[PDB]
Amino acid sequence: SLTAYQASSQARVDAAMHTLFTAPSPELARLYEAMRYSVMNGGKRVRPLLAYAACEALGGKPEQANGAACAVELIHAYSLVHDDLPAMDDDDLRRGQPTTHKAFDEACAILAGDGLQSLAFSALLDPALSDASAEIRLRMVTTLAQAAGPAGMVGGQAIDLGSVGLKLDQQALEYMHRHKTGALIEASVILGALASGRAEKGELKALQTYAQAIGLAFQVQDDILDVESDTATLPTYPALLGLAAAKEYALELRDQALHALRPFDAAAEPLRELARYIVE
Amino acid sequence: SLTAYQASSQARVDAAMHTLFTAPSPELARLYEAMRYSVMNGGKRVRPLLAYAACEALGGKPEQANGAACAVELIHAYSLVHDDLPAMDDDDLRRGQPTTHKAFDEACAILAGDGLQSLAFSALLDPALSDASAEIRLRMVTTLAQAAGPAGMVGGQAIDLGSVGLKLDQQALEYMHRHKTGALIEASVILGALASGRAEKGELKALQTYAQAIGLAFQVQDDILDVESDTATLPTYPALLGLAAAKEYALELRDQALHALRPFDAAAEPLRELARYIVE
Ligand SMILES: [Mg+2]
Ligand SMILES: [Mg+2]
Ligand SMILES: [Mg+2]
Numbered sequence: 001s002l003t004a005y006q007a008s009s010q011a012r013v014d015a016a017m018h019t020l021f022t023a024p025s026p027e028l029a030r031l032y033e034a035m036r037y038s039v040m041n042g043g044k045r046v047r048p049l050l051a052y053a054a055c056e057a058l059g060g061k062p063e064q065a066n067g068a069a070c071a072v073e074l075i076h077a078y079s080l081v082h083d084d085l086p087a088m089d090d091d092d093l094r095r096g097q098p099t100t101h102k103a104f105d106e107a108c109a110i111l112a113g114d115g116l117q118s119l120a121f122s123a124l125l126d127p128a129l130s131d132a133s134a135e136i137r138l139r140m141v142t143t144l145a146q147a148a149g150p151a152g153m154v155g156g157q158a159i160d161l162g163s164v165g166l167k168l169d170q171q172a173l174e175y176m177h178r179h180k181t182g183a184l185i186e187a188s189v190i191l192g193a194l195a196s197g198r199a200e201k202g203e204l205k206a207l208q209t210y211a212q213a214i215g216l217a218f219q220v221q222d223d224i225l226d227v228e229s230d231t232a233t234l235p236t237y238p239a240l241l242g243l244a245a246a247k248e249y250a251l252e253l254r255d256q257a258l259h260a261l262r263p264f265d266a267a268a269e270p271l272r273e274l275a276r277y278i279v280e
Numbered sequence: 281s282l283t284a285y286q287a288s289s290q291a292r293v294d295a296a297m298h299t300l301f302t303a304p305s306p307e308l309a310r311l312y313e314a315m316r317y318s319v320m321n322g323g324k325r326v327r328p329l330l331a332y333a334a335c336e337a338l339g340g341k342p343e344q345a346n347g348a349a350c351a352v353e354l355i356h357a358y359s360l361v362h363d364d365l366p367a368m369d370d371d372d373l374r375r376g377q378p379t380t381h382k383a384f385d386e387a388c389a390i391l392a393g394d395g396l397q398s399l400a401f402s403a404l405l406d407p408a409l410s411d412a413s414a415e416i417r418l419r420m421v422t423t424l425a426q427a428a429g430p431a432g433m434v435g436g437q438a439i440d441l442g443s444v445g446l447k448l449d450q451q452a453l454e455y456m457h458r459h460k461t462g463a464l465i466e467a468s469v470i471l472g473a474l475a476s477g478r479a480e481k482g483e484l485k486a487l488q489t490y491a492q493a494i495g496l497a498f499q500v501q502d503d504i505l506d507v508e509s510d511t512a513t514l515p516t517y518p519a520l521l522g523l524a525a526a527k528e529y530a531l532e533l534r535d536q537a538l539h540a541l542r543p544f545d546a547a548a549e550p551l552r553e554l555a556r557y558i559v560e
């Protein structure tokens with residue numbers, strides 16, 4: 001089941017990340033603690049799940065993707081630490097608990113995020129977290145840097161900033177989302193597939209399509225749930241499309257993701273289950 | 281001369297970095313502009329100079345180290361963008377011109393720094409900026425991530441934060457400096473040496489020793505110059521050692537750096553000139 005697969009994914013990446021967060025000296029203890037706080041918050045580890053699942057879909061042992069899984073989670077975690085800062089989203093809480101700058105301070109949170117990004121690259125190339133060839137590994141870091149950087153995730157965040165008080169159309173909203181969250185979701189599946197040592201051109205293309213579709217499905221579904229909650233109590237896909245059409249679109253995106261996985265056997269079931277889960 | 285070598289180093293890295301800073305879309309233009317602003321400020325490019333000089337000391341063509349040079353400058357630049365933020369150093373000016381958060385805003389500066397770090401890794405592995413083997417290149421990214429991250433430069437910044445209002449001894453001050461600036465100086469020489477494709481174990485060790493010595497020499501000399509300026513107008517090495525002893529120490533560090541380069545021929549002259557320059 002997806003519940004079982006999420007639990008195994010979470011346990012595996014959490015255990016793998018453990019070693020990364022021991023300070024080499026007492027002087028550095030607080031920094032490493034702030035990084036741990038930013039990561040070890042009981043997160044659902046969807047990005048590790050995607051990396052492990054992509055690896056297994058191609059016949060790899062999941063631990064082959066430990067470096068991939070750690071890297072994408074560390075990039076994700078750093079992005080949230082910075083996003084929560086007063087200069088950005090200005091959030092005092094995340095999932096009910098104080099954000100890193102509140103539990104520590106702003107300077108510490110800035111540095112914790114900066115350190116987490118560097119650690120993500122270290123994890124990708126750590127021989128204990130994988131065994132892929134130098135060349136496969138080359139591809140991995142190239143992909144992560146492109147996905148995480150100013151043409152990917154950071155670019156998405158900058159688009160989000162630059163769109164405050166603009167009336168975006170569907171194309172613009174999707175473009176933003178594809179950067180802000182799609183890029184790192186795609187990196188998760190591509191890195192895990194690469195980690196198997198068995199990935200062919202066609203399969204990577206298929207996984208890219210899958211990843212982009214679930215990336216958008218998450219965003220569309222989030223908007224639908226917001227409207228349904230507001231209806232219950234009182235630029236979005238429902239505003240642009242109408243709620244009925246937005247609902248149809250979320251199902252369409254799920255179906256696009258499932259269709260992209262047609263070249264894979266039963267070993268891809270966790271990826272199929274995740275796509276279904278998004279709209280359940 | 282060192283003037284000539286600095287000029288060539290600056291020109292080469294600036295030209296190499298140029299391509300990196302064109303936005304792939306109008307939506308991303310402001311982010312790329314903020315990154316350019318943070319880098320293209322007329323900086324002296326000491327870290328690129330070190331990378332090129334280390335490469336040439338081992339018989340490489342300097343352009344072999346373009347990826348190394350760009351990477352270390354991009355990491356340096358990102359570190360300053362974050363350091364200038366109100367939550368950190370709170371500086372409105374850098375080298376006489378408005379800092380990135382002042383010319384743009386804080387959110388943009390946070391993201392520009394985040395994007396610059398990702399770009400540093402991209403530059404390291406860009407086939408247009410070097411031609412080293414996948415394996416040499418593996419070593420390069422490993423080294424950069426260790427130097428830049430929470431056990432290196434970011435660690436140094438965290439030590440600096442955690443030392444506010446402490447009376448540090450010489451050992452503690454040096455430990456901080458070795459992290460805050462020494463790590464990236466060492467990465468500059470090691471990455472450039474690796475880029476030559478000709479680096480042997482003993483030569484890398486020698487360059488590490490050179491790098492640590494000039495890293496400290498810069499810090500000691502800075503403190504001496506601060507005291508001499510204060511004397512002229514009105515935890516530091518002069519306070520801990522006495523000014524006379526601090527002066528002797530700066531010369532000692534220069535001599536340690538020069539001694540470390542004894543295994544190299546005339547091709548290492550720019551590294552020797554830089555060591556002499558620090559105390560002139
Ligand atoms: Mg928020
Ligand atoms: Mg090979
Ligand atoms: Mg939304």
Ligand SMILES: [Mg+2]
Nearest residue numbers: 363364369371
């Ligand atoms: Mg300052």
Ligand SMILES: [Mg+2]
Nearest residue numbers: 499502503516
């Ligand atoms: Mg000083």
